[PDB]
Structure 1
Amino acid sequence: SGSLADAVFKSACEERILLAYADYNPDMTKVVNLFSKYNETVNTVRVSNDAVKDILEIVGWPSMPLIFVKGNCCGGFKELYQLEESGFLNEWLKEHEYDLAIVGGGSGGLAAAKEAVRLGKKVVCLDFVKPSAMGTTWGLGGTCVNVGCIPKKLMHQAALLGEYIEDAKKFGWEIPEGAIKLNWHQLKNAVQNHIASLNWGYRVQLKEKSVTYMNSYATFTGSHELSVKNKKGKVEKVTADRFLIAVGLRPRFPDVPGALECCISSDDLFSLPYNPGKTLCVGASYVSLECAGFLKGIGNDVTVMVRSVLLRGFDQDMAERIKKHMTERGVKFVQCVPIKYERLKKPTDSEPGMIRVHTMQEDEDGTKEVTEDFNTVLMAIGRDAMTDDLGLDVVGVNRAKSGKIIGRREQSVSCPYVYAIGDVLYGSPELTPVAIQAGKVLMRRLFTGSSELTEYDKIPTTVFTPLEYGSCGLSEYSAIQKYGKENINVYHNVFIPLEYAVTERKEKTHCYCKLICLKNEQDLILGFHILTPNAGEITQGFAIALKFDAKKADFDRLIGIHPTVAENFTTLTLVKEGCXG
C-alpha cells in the first residue's frame, strides 16, 4: 500500500523535484504543468497510508501532498505556486556557486560546516565579528570560543584554584605565609593564548576539509544571493541552493544614559588589558552571576544589581540558595536598576577607569538619588539577536519581535531553503552543544534524507557559579504548576563533599540536591537539581535517565561509587514537606 518515510526522504534528497502523494492526486498536472515551464521533470512517490502522519510530523506540514525542491520540503501546491509567482522558484532551479551558504562561524555554523563537508557538499562559511561599542573584536569560533563558555570556565577555574590553595594548607601543604594575589594580566594572557589556539584550530580545520571560509559580514540581496563585506570594505556576492543562519546574539544594552559609554559587556571582559577592580555586575542572568562569582574569587569587590529575582527561568529555590552562598562568599546583592552611568575616569592601557552609578533608593521618610563609584560596570541583562541588517525581508524569512528566526523545526517557517540553528532560532535553548547538535543533525536530514530530530527537551545545564548548579528537567515550581502539589514527590538531601570535610569552607553548609517526581506515575523523574563542586560532571550522565522515563526506583537500584557527591542521587529517602499480620 505504498512506500515508507526513509524511502520517501532518500528519494527527496536524491531527486531534483519529488511529489509525495497519498490517497488522491488532485492537481498533479498543475504541478507537472508548473515545472514543465522550466524543463524540470517531476518524480513521484505513493506514500503508505500508515506512514503519512509520521512523514507530516517530521517536515512539519498539515496534510499531503508534499513537494520537494533540491531536497527541501516546500509544502503543497499552494506554497509552490507562491514561490513560482514571486520568481523565487525560477532562481532556485538555477545552478549556484555553493550547495550551502552558512552565515555564522560559531558553535552551530562550524559544526554544520564540518558535517556538510563530511557528506561531500560544497559549502561556504561566512563569519564576521562587528566590534563591541568599546572597540573589542576577535577570531573565528563564535561566542563560546572567544567571549563565552571557554574564557568563562577558565576564569571560574582561576577562582576555584584560589579556594584550592587554602584547602592545600589544611591538607598539610606548607605554603609560605603571605597573602596571595591573582595577577589579572597573566590570567587574561593565559586565556587569550588558549582562545588564539582555538581560533587557529578552527581556521585550519576549515582549510583541511575544503570549506571556503570568508571573514565577511553577509546580507541577503537576492532570493539565492548574499552580499558579503570584508574588514577593508570589499563587497563580494555569494550564491547558494541553501542557506543556514547561525549568527547568534550579542549582549543587550538598556535605554539608560551612559550604559553604552560606561559599561563593558562579556564581549570586553575576557580581553580587558586591566584588572577590572571594584566591579558592578548589572543583571540576573547566569552570565551576570558567573562573572560576579569568579571576579570575587580572584579578590575583587563585587556588587550585583538585579531588577527582582536571580536566574529567571531556573528553579527559584536553587537560585535563592546560590544567592545565600554567594552572599556568604562576600558578593553584595542589591535590588535596584541604575537610572544613569557617568564616566569619571577612562581606563589607561593598564589601570581601570571609574564610573559613577546613579540609583533611586527608598527611605521610610521619602526617596533619594544615590550614587556609588565602581572601577568597572558589566552590563549582563541579556543577549539579543542582531538580525535587522541581514536582509531577511529580501528572502522573506519571518522573524519574531526579538529578532530570532521562526522555525518549522530548523527550516524558516516562510522560506523552504533557508534554515536556522543555535541561539538565533526562536525557542532554541541558548547552549553550545544544542547549536552543535542542531547543525550536525540538520546536515544529515538535508544531505542523507534521515528522520533524525534534535531533542530540545530535558537538556541538562550547569550554571558555573562559585558553587556550581547542575540541572535537568522541570523546576519544583513547574512540576507543581503542571501536575498539582498532591501529585509531586520532591526527594532531597544535604551532603558535604569529602574534599571539604577537613576544611572550614562555607560550601560545607550549602551543598544540596533534589529529585522531582510524578507521584501518580511511579515517581517518574521530571527533573533533578544539584548544588555542588563538579555539578556539570555529575549532571551530564544522570540526564540520560530522562531519555528512558527513569523512576525513583531506577535511581535507588543504581549502585553508588564511593566516595563521590554523585552517589547522593542513589540514596534519597527524605521527602520535602513491620508485617502488621
Structure 2
Amino acid sequence: GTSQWLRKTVDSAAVILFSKTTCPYCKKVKDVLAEAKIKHATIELDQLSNGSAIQKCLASFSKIETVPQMFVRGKFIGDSQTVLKYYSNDELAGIVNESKYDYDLIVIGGGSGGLAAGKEAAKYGAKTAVLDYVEPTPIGTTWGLGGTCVNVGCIPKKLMHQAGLLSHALEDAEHFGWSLDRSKISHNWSTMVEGVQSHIGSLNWGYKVALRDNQVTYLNAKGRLISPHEVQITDKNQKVSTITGNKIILATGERPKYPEIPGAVEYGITSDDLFSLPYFPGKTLVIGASYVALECAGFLASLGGDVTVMVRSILLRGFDQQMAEKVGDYMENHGVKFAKLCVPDEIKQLKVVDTENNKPGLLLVKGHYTDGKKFEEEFETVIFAVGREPQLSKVLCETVGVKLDKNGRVVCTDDEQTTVSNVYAIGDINAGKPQLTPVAIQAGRYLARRLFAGATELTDYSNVATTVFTPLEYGACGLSEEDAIEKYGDKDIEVYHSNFKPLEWTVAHREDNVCYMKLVCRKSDNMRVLGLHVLGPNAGEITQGYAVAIKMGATKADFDRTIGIHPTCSETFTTLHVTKKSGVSPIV
C-alpha cells in the first residue's frame, strides 16, 4: 500500500525533498534550496502517521534511511553533505534541470482549468508550458487569454445580467421615495460593452502577468498531441515546431454549435460574438432553450430589446422541469416572447450589416411548428444557442491512443487519467462531469498536487450546485424532483415547499407568490435532503452555503433545528412545513 504511493510520488515529481520539521540538517538544505531559487515540493515525515514506514521505504531508492533526501525526476540526488557539495561546486543548477523532456508538464488550453493546473504545478518546481489559441468565429471575432468563462461566458454574461437587473432598481427607487422617472431613461449598448470589455482586458493582462510571475512559459499557439510525449505547435506566422513534455494535460474546452440550415453560419451569430458586438442587436431572435439562450434573451429584454425565443421542445432540458417552467413563465410575463414547439429552416439576408453607421442588418427567418404550421418573421439579429461541443480531432492524433466517448469527450478514470498513462484531461472535455468553471479549476489544482507533490485527494464531482442567471434567478443543488422519484419511487419521496415574497418587493408593489423554493427528501433515509431548489433574487448567494450541508448529508431535521436570519429570503428554508402530498396550498 504505502510502497506503491512512494514509487508513484518519486517518479513523477520534478524536485522533491523528504524532510522532518525537527531535524536541523533538513533546514540547512531548505535554506540552500531557497537561496538558489529552486522550487520544490516538500514532505515532512513527522506529520504523516505512516511516516516511519515511509522513511524505511525510502531506502529502496537511496540505500539510506535518514532525512533529508532530495530527488530530481525519479533519481536520488543525495543527503545533506552531497547537496552542499554540489552547491559550492556550481554543479547543483545543472542537476536540477536534468530532464529527458523539454517540460515536466505541457498544458493544452489556456482557460479555467488549464490556467489553474499550470499555475499550481509550477509552485512545486515543475517546468511548465501553457498553450492557448482562440480560433476566430465565422465573422472573425477573437479574444485574449483566459478561456470561455472569462471572455465569452460567465463574466460578461453576469455583468450584462447586472445591467438588466438595474432597470428594476430604477423602477423600485420611485416607490422608495427617489425623484427619478423610469419612463424617461434609456440604455446605451455600446457604453456597456466598452465597460465590460475593459474589465475582460484587465483579466487577460492579469493572467499573462501571473504566468510570468510563476515562471510558466506562455505560448500563444495551437497545440496538437502527435505522440504521448510530443506536442506540435503552430504560431501566429504559421511556423511549426515540436516540444516534448513528461505529463500532458488536455484542457481545450468547447465552442458553440450551429444548426445545419442555410444561412445560419453566414448570417447568424452566437454567444461567442455577442459579448463584444459593436452595435445593439435590435429586434432579436434567440434559437434554443438552454441557460445560455434564456440568460441572453433575458438581459436583452431588460435592456430595451424586442426579443423572441424559439423552443424546439422544453426549457432547460436536464434541470427540474417544474422549476424550468416557472423560470419561463416569469420571463414571458416580463417582456420575452416565445415561439413554442418550433424550429428554424433557413435564414435569408435582406440587409447587410451597416459596419460604417454601426447598425445591424435585417434577416428573414423561416421555420415550422411541430404540427406543421409555418413560421416566417423578420429580425435584425439571430442568435443560435443550440449547444456546445469539443473538436478533439484538431487536438489529438488518432494514433496516440486517447479513447473518446460517443459525443467526442475524453474517457477518464476518477483521477483524470486517460487511456494513455501520462496524458490527462480536465474541464469541459472530461466525459460525464459537470461543465462548470469552479469544477474545472478544482479538478486542475488537485491534479497538479497529485502529479508533483505526492498529494492523494481527488476531485468530488457529486452534488455540485448551479445558478441560472435569468431575470428571476434559479439556484439548485442535487437531484431534481422527477429524478429522485425515478430512483427511489414516489412513495419514498417527500417534498416540502413554499412560496415567498422578498421584503424589498413589498414597497415596490411586486408579485406576491412568484418566488418559490422546495426541498426533495428521502423518507427511508431519515428524511435526507436529496435536492434543494429556489427561484428568486440573489439565488446563487442563497444556494451556495447549503451545498456544504448537503455534502455533509443534511436531513430535514438539520434544517428544522437551524434558526433563520431575519429578514432574508433564505430563512424560508429553515421553517418549511407544507408537503405536496398534503395537497395544502404553498402560497403565503
Same fold (TM over 0.5): yes
Cα distance in 2 for residues equivalent to 1:389 and 1:340: 29
Query: Does residue 1:155 correspond to 2:160, yes or no?
Result: yes
Deviation at 1:343, TM superposition (A): 1.6
Cα distance in 1 for residues equivalent to 2:107 and 2:418: 18
Aligned to 1:89: none
Query: Does residue 1:139 correspond to 2:144, yes or no?
Result: yes
Cα distance in 1 for residues equivalent to 2:431 and 2:495: 32
Deviation at 1:368, TM superposition (A): 4.7
Q: 1:345 aligns with which of 327, 347, 351?
A: 351
Query: Does residue 1:391 correspond to 2:396, yes or no?
Result: yes
Specify the code of the residue in structure 2 equivalent to 1:522. Answer: N
Q: 2:558 aligns with which of 541, 554, 560?
A: 554
Cα distance in 2 for residues equivalent to 1:386 and 1:179: 48
Match runs of 1:501-580 below 5 Å: 501-506=506-511, 508-577=512-581
Cα distance in 2 for residues equivalent to 1:346 and 1:100: 47
Cα distance in 2 for residues equivalent to 1:487 and 1:402: 35
Query: Does residue 1:431 correspond to 2:436, yes or no?
Result: yes
Q: Residues 173 and 390 from structure 1, CA distance in 2 versus in 1: closer, same or farther, beyond 3 angstroms? A: same
Specify the code of the residue in structure 1 equivalent to 2:343. Answer: V
Deviation at 1:509, TM superposition (A): 2.9
Deviation at 1:413, TM superposition (A): 3.5
Specify the code of the residue in structure 2 equivalent to 1:12. Answer: K
| Partners of 2:171 and 2:182 within 8 A in 1 | no
Aligned to 1:330: 335
Q: 1:215 aligns with which of 220, 226, 231?
A: 220
Q: Residues 315 and 361 from structure 1, CA distance in 2 versus in 1: closer, same or farther, beyond 3 angstroms? A: closer
Cα distance in 2 for residues equivalent to 1:566 and 1:362: 41
Deviation at 1:222, TM superposition (A): 2.9
Deviations along 1:470-510, whole A, 9 cap, x unmatched? 0000000001110111111100010101111111234x431
Q: 1:357 aligns with which of 357, 365, 375?
A: 365
Specify the code of the residue in structure 1 equivalent to 2:7. Answer: S
Cα distance in 2 for residues equivalent to 1:490 and 1:232: 60
Question: Secondary structure, in 3 states, of the residue corresponding to 2:467?
Answer: strand
Specify the code of the residue in structure 2 equivalent to 1:100. Answer: L
Deviation at 1:396, TM superposition (A): 1.1
Specify the code of the residue in structure 2 equivalent to 1:434. Answer: V
Question: Secondary structure, in 3 states, of the residue corresponding to 1:219?
Answer: strand
| Partners of 1:219 and 1:227 within 8 A in 2 | yes
Deviation at 1:522, TM superposition (A): 1.4
Query: Does residue 1:291 correspond to 2:296, yes or no?
Result: yes
Query: Does residue 1:280 correspond to 2:280, yes or no?
Result: no
Cα distance in 1 for residues equivalent to 2:575 and 2:436: 31
Farther-moved stretch of structure 1 (377-386 vs 169-178): 169-178
Cα distance in 2 for residues equivalent to 1:392 and 1:539: 42
Cα distance in 1 for residues equivalent to 2:376 and 2:322: 32
Aligned to 1:59: none
Aligned to 2:180: 175
Aligned to 1:420: 425
Deviation at 1:254, TM superposition (A): 1.3
Cα distance in 2 for residues equivalent to 1:177 and 1:162: 8
Aligned to 1:240: 245
Match runs of 1:247-262 below 5 Å: 247-262=252-267
Aligned to 1:90: none
Cα distance in 2 for residues equivalent to 1:354 and 1:519: 57
Cα distance in 2 for residues equivalent to 1:381 and 1:154: 22
Deviations along 1:36-85, whole A, 9 cap, x unmatched? xxxxxxxxxxxx9xxxxxxxxxxxxxxxxxxxxx78xxxxxxxxxxxxxx
Aligned to 1:313: 318
> Tell me, which stretches of 5 or more residues in structure 2 are unaligned?
14-49, 51-72, 75-97, 582-588
Deviation at 1:514, TM superposition (A): 0.4
Cα distance in 2 for residues equivalent to 1:244 and 1:272: 33
Cα distance in 2 for residues equivalent to 1:439 and 1:151: 23
Specify the code of the residue in structure 2 equivalent to 1:464. Answer: F
Deviation at 1:359, TM superposition (A): 1.2
Cα distance in 2 for residues equivalent to 1:521 and 1:223: 47
Cα distance in 1 for residues equivalent to 2:259 and 2:183: 43
Specify the code of the residue in structure 2 equivalent to 1:222. Answer: S
| Partners of 2:226 and 2:397 within 8 A in 1 | no
Deviation at 1:412, TM superposition (A): 4.2
Q: Percent identity?
A: 52
| Partners of 1:411 and 1:417 within 8 A in 2 | no
Aligned to 1:302: 307
Q: Residues 491 and 174 from structure 1, CA distance in 2 versus in 1: closer, same or farther, beyond 3 angstroms? A: same
Match runs of 1:460-499 below 5 Å: 460-499=465-504
Query: Does residue 1:200 correspond to 2:205, yes or no?
Result: yes
Specify the code of the residue in structure 2 equivalent to 1:8. Answer: Q
TM-score (norm 1): 0.83
Deviation at 1:95, TM superposition (A): 0.4
Cα distance in 2 for residues equivalent to 1:236 and 1:564: 59
Cα distance in 2 for residues equivalent to 1:515 and 1:206: 44
Aligned to 2:123: 118
| Partners of 2:342 and 2:370 within 8 A in 1 | no
Query: Does residue 1:230 correspond to 2:232, yes or no?
Result: no
Question: Secondary structure, in 3 states, of the residue corresponding to 1:408?
Answer: coil
Aligned to 1:14: 10
Deviation at 1:545, TM superposition (A): 1.0
Specify the code of the residue in structure 1 equivalent to 2:571. Answer: E
TM-score (norm 2): 0.82
| Partners of 1:490 and 1:575 within 8 A in 2 | yes
Deviation at 1:576, TM superposition (A): 1.3
Specify the code of the residue in structure 2 equivalent to 1:566. Answer: S
Deviation at 1:256, TM superposition (A): 1.1
| Partners of 1:220 and 1:394 within 8 A in 2 | no
Number of corresponding residues? 499
Cα distance in 1 for residues equivalent to 2:367 and 2:192: 33
Question: Secondary structure, in 3 states, of the residue corresponding to 1:292?
Answer: helix
Q: Residues 410 and 377 from structure 1, CA distance in 2 versus in 1: closer, same or farther, beyond 3 angstroms? A: farther
Deviations along 1:141-174, whole A, 9 cap, x unmatched? 0000000000000000000011111001111111
Cα distance in 2 for residues equivalent to 1:223 and 1:8: 23
Tell me the C-alpha RMSD between the 2 structures.
Answer: 1.9
Specify the code of the residue in structure 1 equivalent to 2:534. Answer: I
Aligned to 1:269: 274
